[PDB]
Amino acid sequence: GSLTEDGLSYKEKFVVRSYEVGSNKTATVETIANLLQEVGCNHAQSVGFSATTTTMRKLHLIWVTARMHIEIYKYPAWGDVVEIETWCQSEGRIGTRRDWILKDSVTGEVTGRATSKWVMMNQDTRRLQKVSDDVRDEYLVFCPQEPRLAFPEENNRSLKKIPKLEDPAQYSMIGLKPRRADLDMNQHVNNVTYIGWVLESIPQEIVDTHELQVITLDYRRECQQDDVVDSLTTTTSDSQFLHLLRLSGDGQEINRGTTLWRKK
Amino acid sequence: GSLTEDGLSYKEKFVVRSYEVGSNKTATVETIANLLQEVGCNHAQSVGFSATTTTMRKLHLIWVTARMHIEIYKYPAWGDVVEIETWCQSEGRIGTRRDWILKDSVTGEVTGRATSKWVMMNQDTRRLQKVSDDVRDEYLVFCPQEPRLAFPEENNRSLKKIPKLEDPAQYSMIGLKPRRADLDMNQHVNNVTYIGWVLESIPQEIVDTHELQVITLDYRRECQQDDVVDSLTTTTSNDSQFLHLLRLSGDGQEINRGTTLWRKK
Ligand SMILES: CNS(=O)(=O)c1cccc(C)c1F
Ligand SMILES: CNS(=O)(=O)c1cccc(C)c1F
Numbered sequence: 001g002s003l004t005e006d007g008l009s010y011k012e013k014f015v016v017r018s019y020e021v022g023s024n025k026t027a028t029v030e031t032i033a034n035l036l037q038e039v040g041c042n043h044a045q046s047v048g049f050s051a052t053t054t055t056m057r058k059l060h061l062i063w064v065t066a067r068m069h070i071e072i073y074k075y076p077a078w079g080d081v082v083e084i085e086t087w088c089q090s091e092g093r094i095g096t097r098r099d100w101i102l103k104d105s106v107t108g109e110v111t112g113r114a115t116s117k118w119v120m121m122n123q124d125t126r127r128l129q130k131v132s133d134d135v136r137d138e139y140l141v142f143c144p145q146e147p148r149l150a151f152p153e154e155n156n157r158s159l160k161k162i163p164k165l166e167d168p169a170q171y172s173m174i175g176l177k178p179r180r181a182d183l184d185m186n187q188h189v190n191n192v193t194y195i196g197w198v199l200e201s202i203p204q205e206i207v208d209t210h211e212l213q214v215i216t217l218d219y220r221r222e223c224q225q226d227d228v229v230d231s232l233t234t235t236t237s238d239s240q241f242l243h244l245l246r247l248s249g250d251g252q253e254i255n256r257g258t259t260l261w262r263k264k
Numbered sequence: 265g266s267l268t269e270d271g272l273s274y275k276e277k278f279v280v281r282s283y284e285v286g287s288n289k290t291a292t293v294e295t296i297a298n299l300l301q302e303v304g305c306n307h308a309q310s311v312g313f314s315a316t317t318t319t320m321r322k323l324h325l326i327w328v329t330a331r332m333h334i335e336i337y338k339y340p341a342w343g344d345v346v347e348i349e350t351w352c353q354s355e356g357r358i359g360t361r362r363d364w365i366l367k368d369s370v371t372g373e374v375t376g377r378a379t380s381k382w383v384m385m386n387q388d389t390r391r392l393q394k395v396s397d398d399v400r401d402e403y404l405v406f407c408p409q410e411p412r413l414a415f416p417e418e419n420n421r422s423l424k425k426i427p428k429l430e431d432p433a434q435y436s437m438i439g440l441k442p443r444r445a446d447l448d449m450n451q452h453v454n455n456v457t458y459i460g461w462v463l464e465s466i467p468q469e470i471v472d473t474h475e476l477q478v479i480t481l482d483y484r485r486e487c488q489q490d491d492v493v494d495s496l497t498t499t500t501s502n503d504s505q506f507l508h509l510l511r512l513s514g515d516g517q518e519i520n521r522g523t524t525l526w527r528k529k
Contacts, residue, residue: 018305019298019456021449030445034283041282045343078449079309175439180471181294181460185285185342192283196445207444 001042008144009087010043013105016076024264026075027082029199029212033070033192036100036114039084051118053138060123063096065191067117069151069158069216074104074111081105089143093130095119096139099150113150115158162218162256165244169232173200175248176229189223198243198257201233210239210261217257223247229254238262265306272408273351274307277369280340290339291346293463293476297334297456300364300378303348317402320384325399327360327382329455333415333422333480338368338375345369353407357394359383360403363414377414379422390486426482426521429509433496437464439513440493453487458520462508465497466524470504474526477503481522487512493519502528 001012020031044050051063076082083103091097095118102112120129151158182193198217199207223229228248233241236258243257265276284295308315315327340346347367355361359382366376383392384399415422446457459481463471487493492513497506500523508522 017298017302019301019448019454022444022447023449023451025449028445034281037283038281175441176443177439179440179460179464180286181292183286184283185287185289187287190283196443200443 001039001046003043003046004085007047008142009085009148010039010046011083011085012039012042013081013083014038016078016080016082018078021078023208024075024211025078027077028075029070029072029215030192030196032072032075032102032112032114033068033195035082035084036070036086036116037192039086039100040098043086043088047142049139049142053136055132055135055138056120061120061129062123063118064121065116065219066095066119067216067218068114068191068195069116069214070112070114071157071214072102072112072212074109075211076104076111082111087144087148088139089148090131090136090140091117095131099148101150115150157214157216160216160258162216162258163242164253164256165232165234165242167232169201169234169244171201171203171233172230173197174230176200176231177227178223178225183225187225189225191219194219194223194245194255197229197231197245198233198255199259201231201243202241202259206239206261209264211264212259213238213262214260215257217243217255219255221252221254223254265303265310267307267310268349271311272406273349273412274303274310275347275349276303276306277345277347278302280342280344280346282342285342287472288339288475290341292339293334293336293479294456294460296336296339296366296376297332297459299346299348300334300350300380301454301456303350303364304362307350307352311406313403315382317399319396319399319402323399324387325384325393326387328385329380329483330359330383331381331480331482332378332455332459333380333478334376334378335421335478336366336376336476339475340366340368340375346375351408351412352403353412354395354400354404355381356400359395363412365414379414421478421480421525424480424523426480426523427507428518428521429496429498429507431496433465433509434498435465435467435496437461437495440464440495441491442487442489447489451489453489455483458483458487458510461493461495461510462497462520462522462524465495465508466506466526470526473529474504475529476524477527478525479522481508481520483520485517485519487519 083105086100089097100114232244239261245255347369349365364378494513496509504526506524510520
């Protein structure tokens with residue numbers, strides 16, 4: 001992959017692998033989400049980051065995902081080339097935004113888009129911070145100056161408030177645990193695992209008849225290596241669902257979400 | 265990737281990804297196993313296979329993995345390029361063997377090697393059987409004629425008999441279940457999931473202080489999408505060795521057995 005001419009965005013091609021596809025022989029939304037993260041990491045590495053910046057590594061600050069929104073129009077097939085472009089933007093004290101556009105490399109057609117909201121947080125205390133007084137001028141040089149939005153439409157799905165699912169759930173998958181393949185290099189559960197856990201309470205009949213078009217997920221609290229998760233889904237409708245992940249015991253909320261599915 | 269000049273083997277390069285690495289900032293053995301499977305798939309495609317032949321698709325026959333043996337000398341770092349060569353050989357009526365060599369693309373040095381034994385199964389009845397000369401003839405052209413072995417050693421760990429771990433296990437991880445990301449495109453549990461389940465009963469202290477050099481895994485029965493697995497490990501030993509068992513958490517039906525060898529970092 002490479003920074004573009006202007007140095008303000010990053011592009012990378014991926015060939016979809018045999019083990020990356022589901023029952024329709026196209027990429028899973030988990031494979032997509034993993035590629036979004038990989039191109040995000042190659043963007044950071046290209047400009048000298050990693051997404052830590054000098055004064056963050058100093059005060060022990062990290063970027064952590066508050067929110068992920070992905071919309072897929074077509075899932076690439078096994079052996080297809082998908083091109084992903086990614087860029088970041090400041091949203092003032094709130095935090096930072098990373099957006100993605102996915103294209104069919106051959107047709108140059110847009111096959112998906114994604115946006116995500118990141119916040120600061122001290123790694124040790126896990127206390128949510130606001131973007132420094134201004135000292136966070138270290139990274140504005142690497143973002144477009146004028147707004148560039150994968151989701152430009154005022155009042156659009158990517159920004160909607162998600163409510164808390166109420167017991168009893170219509171569906172549940174309980175006792176989900178992460179294995180070592182689910183940890184990142186710093187031994188924290190991978191953001192993509194939570195996507196997989198949310199989708200595990202969708203009934204097989206839906207996954208067999210429908211394709212996933214939209215997923216929005218809030219990250220409230222991290223699941224540790226030795227935590228156990230329950231995944232809850234209720235139909236609210238195309239088929240739409242409301243999602244909740246919570247710790248198997250006390251029922252502490254770790255994620256909430258919505259998905260939208262189209263008949264195949 | 266491409267077939268080599270003689271079209272008897274297949275080469276492919278992979279750049280190691282951010283999410284494919286462990287605590288060492290190098291590729292997990294599960295990432296490696298997944299790359300072996302991917303390059304194996306691209307070789308099959310390159311010669312007009314599915315890994316079924318015409319006769320196999322007729323008689324409703326598949327190849328299934330009986331055994332996987334991996335030896336890694338060095339795990340490639342995040343952003344490193346690894347080059348994998350793979351080929352198959354007929355083992356007569358017993359089945360087929362697929363072999364792999366892993367190299368540092370830059371230095372050209374051998375960083376790993378693997379071998380696997382495949383047997384024929386009726387899709388529907390799940391009944392193993394000997395290879396028929398008719399089936400054999402259809403793919404023997406695509407294999408070297410003179411033996412080409414990733415593991416030449418006169419007495420090689422790759423072929424050693426694995427015993428059944430004795431209750432009580434020294435260590436265990438209980439209630440392991442597959443999610444949808446553990447299924448392949450035909451909704452069977454991915455062979456690589458079993459590797460990760462075997463490793464889940466190794467204590468964190470070994471993993472933090474050691475590196476996996478060797479893993480041998482026998483595949484006895486398939487775990488189904490709604491099965492639950494128990495993983496059992498006992499120390500059998502500077503080098504730590506373990507004996508492994510995966511079994512269904514209810515009746516305790518065996519799905520896998522294995523051994524691992526670890527060396528101090
Ligand atoms: C993720 N958020 S970031 O670290 O603030 C950031 C902003 C701009 C460009 C890059 C590469 C970047 F990593
Ligand atoms: C698994 N063994 S195989 O499918 O019979 C086979 C034999 C030779 C070459 C190829 C590509 C092949 F896939």
